[PDB]
Symmetry: C3
């Protein structure tokens, strides 16, 4: 499907918004003030729950300006389709300054990543030979 | 819709889905290791796998370890043609060392669907959009 | 409709390239020298713009080798299909070693992540009950 169902748990929540015509993601808004400490982390409230479309999960991904200006990086970020709790935004602050967040600030984005969510695990003896082979971390 | 998993030793665990319609498969450490505070490390899995056509394997974070322990996955892109042992790269952004024991779930594998057969083509200019050059706002 | 269009904004830019026959990503090249300081961050110029295919966004993802050998993690990372500015690579350096970048170095990789870009947002009083429910961060 294409339907993203959103539950607003309080008057402090904001419906996520699409910031441009073919934006990858939807802006997620803080529903409560919080400070993320320098070289530290915290969890931003949203007061929202959602059910992403079948064939996706909801990825909480960085708002680009916050990364550059404030050293902010999203942590965790995988929202499962069966999750009905409040979605929380985990933020790492890699800068030397505490970062102030106010209720209604855009703190991250939600991307409806398409995935294979019905895969069959098959245990095998070996994998198909490739030119890459075992080469990694080059 | 087939994920082929190779178990390379007795210390490997087949990855597992943590709920009915979980996005990801939990990945298990095959070794004990410490991820130093404000540092990083690499966790063995003793597994290899081949992701389905049109996907790559993203090594994504477990949510509890991020909140409780400051753990974040690094690197994280497993190509479909990789046949080596898959490694979990971990950053510890906390002030506390993080101990991992053999058999702990240290990350999750997500089969991210991608366009892996694009034609890359050089153009003089892109389609004009409302967004334009607007970035990092 | 599987075409990735790349605009080279200068002689210093390099068209991104696949590093193996079925690599997930296209390596992104620095167009200008820069140093990412130990326990710090920076922005890498590419002098490229691109329009990703319909149904995707461009994710600027980390190169594996730089993560383990240099402590490098990409920040931000979400390039919208309608972006026509210069694409910039945000790098965090989590190591104690300044990371020296030279024009022509591979600095990140571009992954054409498939997403639902035409979802309909529907606000509901409650989500469908699941066995997971509000269970998160377990
Ligand atoms: O960025 C975080 C990542 C996870 N979750 C919630 C939703 C997910 O389904 C997750 C699942 O928790 P465990 O399965 O790791 O317990 O917790 C948060 O709200 N957002
Ligand atoms: O978190 C990491 C990311 C990379 N790899 C391995 C598998 C990938 O295919 C990769 C590619 O190495 P280079 O192409 O970056 O050398 O190395 C690890 O096992 N897991
Ligand atoms: O790693 C970064 C992530 C974002 N952008 C650019 C392209 C995106 O479309 C973005 C959008 O800016 P805001 O919408 O966050 O203002 O800016 C960078 O070039 N690369
Ligand atoms: Na290779």
């Amino acid at each position: 499907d294409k339907v993203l169902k959103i539950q607003l748990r309080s008057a402090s929540a904001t419906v996520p918004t699409k910031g441009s015509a073919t934006a990858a993601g939807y802006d997620i808004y803080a529903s409560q003030d919080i400070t993320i400490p320098a070289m530290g982390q915290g969890m931003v409230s949203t007061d929202i729950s959602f059910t992403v479309p079948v064939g996706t999960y909801g990825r909480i991904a960085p708002r680009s300006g916050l990364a550059v200006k404030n050293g902010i990086q999203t942590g965790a970020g995988v929202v499962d389709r069966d999750y009905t709790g409040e979605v929380k935004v985990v933020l790492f602050n890699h800068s030397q300054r505490d970062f102030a967040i106010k209720k209604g600030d855009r703190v991250a984005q939600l991307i409806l990543e398409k995935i294979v969510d019905d895969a069959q695990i098959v245990v095998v003896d070996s994998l198909e030979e490739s030119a890459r082979g075992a080469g990694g971390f080059g």
